[PDB]
Amino acid sequence: SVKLAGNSSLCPVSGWAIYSKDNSVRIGSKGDVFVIREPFISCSPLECRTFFLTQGALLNDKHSNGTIKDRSPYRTLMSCPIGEVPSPYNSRFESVAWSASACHDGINWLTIGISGPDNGAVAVLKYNGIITDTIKSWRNNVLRTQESECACVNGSCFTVMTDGPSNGQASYKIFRIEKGKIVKSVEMNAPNYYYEECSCYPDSSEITCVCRDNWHGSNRPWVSFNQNLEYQIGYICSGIFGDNPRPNDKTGSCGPVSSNGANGVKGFSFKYGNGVWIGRTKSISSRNGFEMIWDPNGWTGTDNNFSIKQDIVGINEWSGYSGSFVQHPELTGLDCIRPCFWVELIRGRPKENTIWTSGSSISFCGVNSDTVGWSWPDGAELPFTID
Amino acid sequence: SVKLAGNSSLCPVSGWAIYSKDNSVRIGSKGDVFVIREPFISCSPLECRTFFLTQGALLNDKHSNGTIKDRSPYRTLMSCPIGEVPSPYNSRFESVAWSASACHDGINWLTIGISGPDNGAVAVLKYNGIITDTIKSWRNNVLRTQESECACVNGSCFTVMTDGPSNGQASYKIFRIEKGKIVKSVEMNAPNYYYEECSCYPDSSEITCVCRDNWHGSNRPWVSFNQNLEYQIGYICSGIFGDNPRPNDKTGSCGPVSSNGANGVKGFSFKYGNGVWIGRTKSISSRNGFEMIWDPNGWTGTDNNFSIKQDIVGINEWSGYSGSFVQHPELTGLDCIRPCFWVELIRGRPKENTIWTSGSSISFCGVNSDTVGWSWPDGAELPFTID
Amino acid sequence: SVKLAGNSSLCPVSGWAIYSKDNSVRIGSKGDVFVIREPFISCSPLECRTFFLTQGALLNDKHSNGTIKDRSPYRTLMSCPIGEVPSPYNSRFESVAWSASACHDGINWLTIGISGPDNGAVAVLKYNGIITDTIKSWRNNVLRTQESECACVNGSCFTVMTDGPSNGQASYKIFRIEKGKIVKSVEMNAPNYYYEECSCYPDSSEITCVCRDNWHGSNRPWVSFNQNLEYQIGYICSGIFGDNPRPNDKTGSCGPVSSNGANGVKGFSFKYGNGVWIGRTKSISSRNGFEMIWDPNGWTGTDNNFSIKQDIVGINEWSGYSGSFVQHPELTGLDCIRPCFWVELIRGRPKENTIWTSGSSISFCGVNSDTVGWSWPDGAELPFTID
Amino acid sequence: SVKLAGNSSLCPVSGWAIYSKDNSVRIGSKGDVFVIREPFISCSPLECRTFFLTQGALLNDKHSNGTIKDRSPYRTLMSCPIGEVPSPYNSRFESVAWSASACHDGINWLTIGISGPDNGAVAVLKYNGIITDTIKSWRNNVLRTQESECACVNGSCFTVMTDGPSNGQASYKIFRIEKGKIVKSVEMNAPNYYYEECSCYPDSSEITCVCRDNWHGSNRPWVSFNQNLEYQIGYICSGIFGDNPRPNDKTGSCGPVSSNGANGVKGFSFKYGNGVWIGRTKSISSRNGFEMIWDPNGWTGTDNNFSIKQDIVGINEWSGYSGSFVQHPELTGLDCIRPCFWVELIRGRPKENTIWTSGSSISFCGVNSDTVGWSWPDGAELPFTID
Ligand SMILES: *[C@@H]1O[C@H](CO)[C@@H](O[C@@H]2O[C@H](CO)[C@@H](O[C@@H]3O[C@H](CO[C@H]4O[C@H](CO)[C@@H](O)[C@H](O)[C@@H]4O)[C@@H](O)[C@H](O[C@H]4O[C@H](CO)[C@@H](O)[C@H](O)[C@@H]4O)[C@@H]3O)[C@H](O)[C@H]2NC(C)=O)[C@H](O)[C@H]1NC(C)=O
Ligand SMILES: *[C@@H]1O[C@H](CO)[C@@H](O[C@H]2O[C@H](CO)[C@@H](O)[C@H](O)[C@H]2NC(C)=O)[C@H](O)[C@H]1NC(C)=O
Ligand SMILES: CCC(CC)O[C@@H]1C=C(C(=O)O)C[C@H](N)[C@H]1NC(C)=O
Ligand SMILES: CCC(CC)O[C@@H]1C=C(C(=O)O)C[C@H](N)[C@H]1NC(C)=O
Ligand SMILES: CCC(CC)O[C@@H]1C=C(C(=O)O)C[C@H](N)[C@H]1NC(C)=O
Ligand SMILES: CCC(CC)O[C@@H]1C=C(C(=O)O)C[C@H](N)[C@H]1NC(C)=O
Ligand SMILES: *[C@@H]1O[C@H](CO)[C@@H](O)[C@H](O)[C@H]1NC(C)=O
Ligand SMILES: *[C@@H]1O[C@H](CO)[C@@H](O)[C@H](O)[C@H]1NC(C)=O
Ligand SMILES: *[C@@H]1O[C@H](CO)[C@@H](O)[C@H](O)[C@H]1NC(C)=O
Ligand SMILES: *[C@@H]1O[C@H](CO)[C@@H](O)[C@H](O)[C@H]1NC(C)=O
Ligand SMILES: *[C@@H]1O[C@H](CO)[C@@H](O)[C@H](O)[C@H]1NC(C)=O
Ligand SMILES: *[C@@H]1O[C@H](CO)[C@@H](O)[C@H](O)[C@H]1NC(C)=O
Ligand SMILES: *[C@@H]1O[C@H](CO)[C@@H](O)[C@H](O)[C@H]1NC(C)=O
Ligand SMILES: *[C@@H]1O[C@H](CO)[C@@H](O)[C@H](O)[C@H]1NC(C)=O
Ligand SMILES: *[C@@H]1O[C@H](CO)[C@@H](O)[C@H](O)[C@H]1NC(C)=O
Ligand SMILES: [Ca+2]
Ligand SMILES: [Ca+2]
Ligand SMILES: [Ca+2]
Ligand SMILES: [Ca+2]
Ligand SMILES: [Ca+2]
Ligand SMILES: [Ca+2]
Ligand SMILES: [Ca+2]
Ligand SMILES: [Ca+2]
Ligand SMILES: [Ca+2]
Ligand code: NA
């Protein structure tokens, strides 16, 4: 058992091969499946797991009523093996949480679960399931974190948290965590930027995060930093705008794009020099479809020209959150950090006529062998009996 | 595999971080979850587990009827991982039981399960699941034990059992157990005191139990003892009365407080010199709400002043039993024994219009980092389909 | 990993302490629990498991119809941990079977599953889940075996099978099995005896079996043998008759007792010199109640006097099959082979008005510490929804 | 962990002993069991597993509707222990897949899952659950593979895939795979032959596959090859025709038998010099019944005489796909590779009045000890509540 090095570079990839699909909402029509949202995948050196925030309720049961609501004392962070439906009969309990992150350092799992009131929430940190630290709201306004895996390099794990309004300037902090203990934190000097729900990955011993600007950006903000949390900030320049909502593609910007910039969705991108692989919704106005786009100058260039598009979910199908996850050399035997991604397929409120909201997931891993575009949607037939 | 030392002091703590919530009643509306009461938590050097008394029945099925009744031949002690719902599909069988205790000495689990008739019940003790001893009622009036973890120091484990009436003087025995074999017991000389449902923990090689006076005490009795079962007795002196029911807070006593003293609820407290961390309901008359209070002179002083209160369950929400559990340094890597606690959130009879009674649970661990009060209640909407 | 020696003697016991209870029929009212009959318990050096023959159907579902029927191609031998309900979500598959045995030699499990036609059934033998032998019907008339654990001594396991009519002379064979291969078999010369559903245990390197005489005996037949299968035969002499049905107690006999001798129930007894611990039903006419009786001269003496009676199930409660199981020193750390027993609590047809028949279980281990009689019945309220 | 040698010969067998039956459809009347088809069994050096293609839906739920359809984005390759029902609570996720194969090389599991569109499907290969390679359709017409285990010899695993029309000449490729990487493939020169759904097994370091001619053969095509993918081709010569549909038995041919040759069913056979063990349906026109036949000159001789027949499923009962699996010496301790087989028992559409199609399974292993013919059918009573 050894710490993940995290010192190799990301594997360059040409396409995305399908890795998992859980069908949770379809199975939940009869089976005992948690109502969940905000799922994500994270791997150890031995396995990949899906983490998710339950609503303390099963699908097709009356307790799923009102699960559009984001924060309650019932919500818990749990995990199961990748591609299995999240059930009380296969799910490991992690934390009481309405916002979370998790990652494995090579030795044990770090989990971060935030609960408590909007005016004073507390992140509880656990290492191997023992509480090892806490951090409390410093702006008293919905302390919130990634909803995806943290990133680890040589025994240190890193995450981003946000505290403040969701329609204006907020405060953003970056953390270094070792064996579940916060050993350093810094508050970002980022005037006119906004960051939340960051998707962060390791790459050549450094951390890159691509986040959501809910304030006034239709492109995605990024922050990268080293083990000492010395950081750099920007927005993805590509005119292939990554957020949802967003305008139609056109010339981009290296700061925040204000057009359709308010609101957003969690997402990700991978940086390869001046190029970028963007995952995004296919619809500009709602969480519908999903596609991956390789723009070989999109990190720093502002044109809307790109070279590869691979379909993942069809434009008439419900999508949702998406996030990065990696497979390290210690897991794969490769000489590089493999990029993967998951997509959350949201069903129910607000877009459908149900009492509940819940998601399934799909996930894909980067390869340089042949791949194909298609649509792998949630597949459930709504409404359900309970509705 | 090594014996827990049990020789360090209790970790000093400033507040309580949420550790687990299982949502059992919410989930059992649809899923297959045991009807249970008398849950508790106990840890080995490798994991923590929820122990509970089943009713041999599942939520929202007809055999849930009558489960207000405490003692039957159908009740079984079973256990599942912390924060998971207790289900037939995830629960390990421990013992046939309508009163129980369990604790891990560092090598194997000890379990104590009392079944049989009210006039001659028998505790069956198991070590690693094998029957290693029995002990029979010696007063023929409902032999009963902790309903929370026993406590272990250097390969010996300790518990308390009571036999006799619940509305007057009863008999109270302390036991030293090694590899599931009773090696010593003493009957306590405790005239005008009453002990049941003790929450016992180790602290610097000695055991301290805080219990329930069902006879005539609205404050809690305590007994502390060494590995030779040489014991000291007393009641918590604080005017912050710990039992339910109780009077409003006023000047306390170091003997039993007779005002509102009859009846009770299982609870716990932690001694820190002359100070005390008290867990109690928020209502003085029913099992509603829960709070943690630090009273720096409350173990020995009778005033009703305290220095810290942390809300756990709101006053208008159902609560129930509570107990202590510890995390030893062999589990955590700390230099001290960490105090934690669980609360049972009882739903159904006698307070609600159901045919059944069952609980869910929440637990917290003591920390010195930032924490917050809130309410994490059961959350189920009663009555259910079967009612 | 080492072979069970099997060379110590049975632990003398003074009473029976309750070990497990599954509540399967109560739980199966809503949960996903197999319809089963013919359960039994068997232990390895690490754990005890319950084996059972499913009917390829779940309780309270339409496929449980007609499960009074003994033999079908749907019936399977499965196992789960002791005291858990048998569900498809916790159950290990063993063999396709309508009659069975299993036992662990210290290294691996042996399972014996008989299926196929009444006129040519085949026992399939498996070691560690691999098929290692078969034995086919030699009288073409329902080849059948113990429905309880086989017995192992020094790497050899032993069982008994029967082939022929159930209302007359049949044929009875004894088998020695090593690593799942039949290494010797003998046909018993036992004119005027009848043996089936033998409960067999090791004791001082030899096997004792106590069986069912369905032809013309209301006491139980026995056969004991060494590793070479050189055997002796007799019937339990005590006037405390062990079978069901049977007459009221009176002077017994050392050969078959013809009064109420046709028909029967699987059962067991333990021999301790000239004395016997007898488990039997409390009713003389039907499968109701259960009790254990220590008769200090009952193996070889014919009087109906006895020393100890311990109630297990009350006379107005349903019982059923019962069988021996042992815990070897390699499991317990004792210097003797510990005797235990289980009882099948049968519900449904033919005594109740249901479409199905299915059983739960209770089990007890022998101890020399204090015990108590009680009733631990099945507890389900019939009929069920499906009826 | 050591690589399976795969260099010994097939064990000679006189008959087939029943190994497993899962009763999936019967159990899924109430419990949470996947709608599935295309099951198959494959073994590591430590256990045997059932692999199957789910429909992303449970039996007796509305999302089972339309499951006659073969290919969708919801289908997933998943696995559970042999003989257990495939449930979301006991099944391991393998791959997104509407056509599949898997096999264990002695060190790790290889899985092959084809998803994507009919005009450009992609097989995703995983080794130990990590994506190790992909291969894309090369004729753009439903890339498809074995629906049974691939075959392994000294660290290399072999499979066959087909691409093109199912009512005419298509293209057939053989693959050598090492640690989940395709290291060699060849396209077969096979004019006038047709191969799909190959059942492949190792025998003396070489692979023999018996497949389905959906174009114009009522006998089965075979291809055998060495580790270099040097291959020989042929059809089974026996006038005991192996496909469904087929003619009644008459003189066979060593080329495709065109009488009733169109359409087909996945099946298997085992070669023993000039002889052959044939598994087939009992009906000549529909997937009903199953029997095993030993024809001592049937691999190369065209007569319709055989030496042994062993009933498996009766003629009036539903059957389906069948395939081979092996137990290598590293698992059994034998000196030869043991042949086994499974049969899928298909229920629902198109033959029955349901909204859904699903299968259960049975399997058998080859022995030289005594065996018996019988019928072990699915057993479920259709239609179901949902229909
Ligand atoms: C939760 O649990 C409670 C407590 O048990 C249930 O309340 C019981 O409900 C049952 C069923 O309704 C009651 O049992 C019934 O009693 C009837 C009347 O019994 C008395 O009066 C008759 C004369 O009419 C006398 O013959 C008899 O000796 C009694 O003095 C009976 O008529 C019913 O009998 C029928 O069913 C039985 C099954 O054994 C048949 O054998 C009979 O022939 C007959 O067909 C029946 O026994 C019982 O009294 C209630 N108990 C209490 C304490 O009130 C709740 O119903 C339950 N709730 C839910 C939701 O399940
Ligand atoms: C339920 O089982 C009954 C019997 O209890 C079924 O009736 C027939 O099939 C059985 C085969 O197992 C036999 O046991 C019966 O003797 C036989 N004939 C009868 C009762 O006349 C009956 O068809 C089944 N019920 C349902 C709902 O299908
Ligand atoms: C709290 C503001 C933030 C951005 C608007 O809300 C997020 C939006 C969500 C969304 O856009 O779907 C779902 C997240 N669960 C929620 N996070 C929390 C902590 O409640
Ligand atoms: C036996 C008397 C005792 C104190 C009143 O009853 C306890 C009270 C209970 C309670 O106050 O909720 C529930 C406990 N399950 C019960 N213990 C037993 C062994 O039945
Ligand atoms: C086969 C005759 C035998 C004795 C009457 O029947 C047994 C009786 C039974 C019984 O008396 O309850 C149940 C057993 N499952 C059955 N065994 C078999 C193989 O069917
Ligand atoms: C694609 C052609 C092929 C042969 C007709 O269809 C198969 C026939 C099937 C059948 O005959 O039952 C079911 C298989 N699931 C299907 N394979 C695929 C990949 O869909
Ligand atoms: C990465 O870290 C490993 C393990 O410590 C080290 O041996 C190696 O020199 C470093 N870099 C690369 C790119 O392999
Ligand atoms: C959902 O909650 C609303 C408002 O509290 C209520 O009207 C409705 O009955 C609920 N539906 C269900 C199925 O519980
Ligand atoms: C990794 O961390 C360890 C322990 O802090 C340290 O010894 C080592 O130098 C670090 N390696 C790098 C490349 O930073
Ligand atoms: C506690 O016990 C340990 C382990 O036996 C021993 O080595 C140590 O000296 C003791 N520590 C304290 C704080 O008393
Ligand atoms: C712990 O127990 C062992 C065995 O009884 C004993 O030798 C040792 O002295 C004990 N340690 C203490 C500190 O009591
Ligand atoms: C039992 O067998 C053990 C282990 O082989 C042996 O050491 C011992 O002598 C035997 N005991 C008796 C009483 O025969
Ligand atoms: C037990 O079996 C082994 C191996 O056959 C043999 O060597 C040994 O003598 C046997 N022991 C006894 C006590 O018979
Ligand atoms: C097969 O291979 C094994 C292991 O490599 C070797 O030892 C043996 O000689 C070979 N066996 C046969 C039957 O050829
Ligand atoms: C099944 O699917 C068909 C086609 O969409 C539809 O017409 C039918 O109503 C569905 N039936 C059920 C019972 O859901
Ligand atoms: Ca935005
Ligand atoms: Ca560009
Ligand atoms: Ca009191
Ligand atoms: Ca005070
Ligand atoms: Ca008899
Ligand atoms: Ca006597
Ligand atoms: Ca259910
Ligand atoms: Ca054909
Ligand atoms: Ca021939
Ligand atoms: Na009956």
Residue numbers in the entry:
A (entry chain B), B (entry chain C), C (entry chain D), D (entry chain A): 82 to 468
From the article:
NA is a homotetrameric transmembrane glycoprotein responsible for cleavage of sialic acid from the host cell membrane. By blocking NA enzymatic activity, neuraminidase inhibitors (NAIs) prevent new viral particles from being released from the surface of an infected cell, thus stopping the spread of virus in the airways. In this study, we applied a set of experimental techniques using recombinant NA variants to understand the molecular basis of development of oseltamivir resistance in the viral N1 neuraminidase NA2009. To decipher the structural mechanism of resistance, we determined crystal structures of NA2009 mutants in complex with oseltamivir carboxylate.
Three variants (H275Y, H275Y/I223V, and H275Y/S247N NA2009) crystallized in the monoclinic space group with four molecules in the asymmetric unit, representing the tetrameric biological unit. In enzyme variants containing H275Y in combination with the I223V or S247N mutation, an oseltamivir pose similar to that found in H275Y was observed. We conclude that structural changes caused by the individual mutations have a coacting effect on increase of oseltamivir resistance, reflected in the more than three-fold increase in Ki in H275Y/I223V NA2009 compared to H275Y NA2009. The double mutations I223V/H275Y and S247N/H275Y led to dramatic increases in Ki values (3900- and 9000-fold higher than wt, respectively). We observed only moderately decreased catalytic efficiency (kcat/Km) for the single mutants I223V and S247N, and much lower values for all variants containing the H275Y substitution (only 4–6% of the wt value for the H275Y, I223V/H275Y, and S247N/H275Y mutants).
